[PDB]
Amino acid sequence: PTVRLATRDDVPRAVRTLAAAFADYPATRHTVDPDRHIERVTELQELFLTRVGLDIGKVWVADDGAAVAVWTTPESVEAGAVFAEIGPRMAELSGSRLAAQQQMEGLLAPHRPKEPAWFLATVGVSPDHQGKGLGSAVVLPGVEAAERAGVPAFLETSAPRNLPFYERLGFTVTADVEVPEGPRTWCMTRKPGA
Ligand SMILES: CC(=O)SCCNC(=O)CCNC(=O)[C@H](O)C(C)(C)COP(=O)(O)OP(=O)(O)OC[C@H]1O[C@@H](n2cnc3c(N)ncnc32)[C@H](O)[C@@H]1OP(=O)(O)O
């Protein structure tokens, strides 16, 4: 279980891991077109991993990409300009589920920290390596970094099996959001010193 920051050479295994990990995720199933679903989800994960994670955020990997963690920090300053580049393509990839994605964003936006914070954008572990402690190991550096910076760490999850996993890392449910014809979503925050 060797954890370190990611390089461009790691992207291929990382994207395979994220695509496989999010294959049956409730939020992805609600917000991404079912037509060529895995292909669409794979491009979204690649687009976020490279253009957001590696370019302006922070990305960690365990066992050369068997697990991945992507964060946006208070240091992620051209998030906005990056969003004008990749934004329209992400809407195309959402396809028929763009209205559902936009509805869900409106429900979660009020519960997001308006103050500077580290956001866990996405985390995935290869299905065959799940339950072996890799997820905890990849997310821990970002959690320690947020605490060192004196800012909260924040995330959103639509899978209730993840609540214990994040609770062990010091996170607490700050919002329990009901999505119409969609998945129940929990917003979680970890203030420095949890
Ligand atoms: C997008 C966001 O910010 S959150 C969405 C994160 N990713 C996903 O939900 C997609 C699929 N899930 C995964 O890739 C992984 O299972 C992770 C990253 C959530 C957890 O990583 P793991 O290596 O499995 O975790 P680790 O071994 O460190 O800890 C195990 C705990 O993870 C939780 N867990 C997460 N996903 C699962 C799952 N599919 N089935 C069972 N338990 C799971 C459980 O609470 C488990 O402990 P438990 O059996 O005692 O309840």
User: 161 alpha carbon to ligand 1 midpoint, in Å?
Assistant: 7
Q: Sheet containing 153-157: give its strands across.
A: 3-5, 58-62, 67-72, 118-125, 153-157, 185-190, 172-177
Nearest CA to ligand 1 atom 43: 161
Distance separating alpha carbons of residues 83 and 131, to the nearest angstrom: 34
Nearest CA to ligand 1 atom 39: 161
From the CA of 126, give the closest atom in ligand 1: 14
Q: Identify the three-state secondary structure at position 5.
A: strand
Partner residues linked to 99 by β-bridges = none
Distance separating alpha carbons of residues 174 and 163, to the nearest angstrom: 12
| CB 66, CB 74: distance < 8 Å | no
Pocket test for ligand 1, best of 120, 130, 134 (most atoms within 8 A of CB): 130
| CB 57, CB 70: distance < 8 Å | yes
Quick one: resolution in A?
2.3
Distance separating alpha carbons of residues 66 and 59, to the nearest angstrom: 13
Query: Which residue segments constitute the domains of the chain, with CATH numbers given?
Result: 3-190 (3.40.630.30)
Q: Which residue has the tokens 């995720």?
A: 25
Q: What residues line ligand 1, using a CB cutoff of 6 Å?
A: 21-22, 25, 120, 122-125, 130-136, 155, 157, 159, 161-162, 164-165
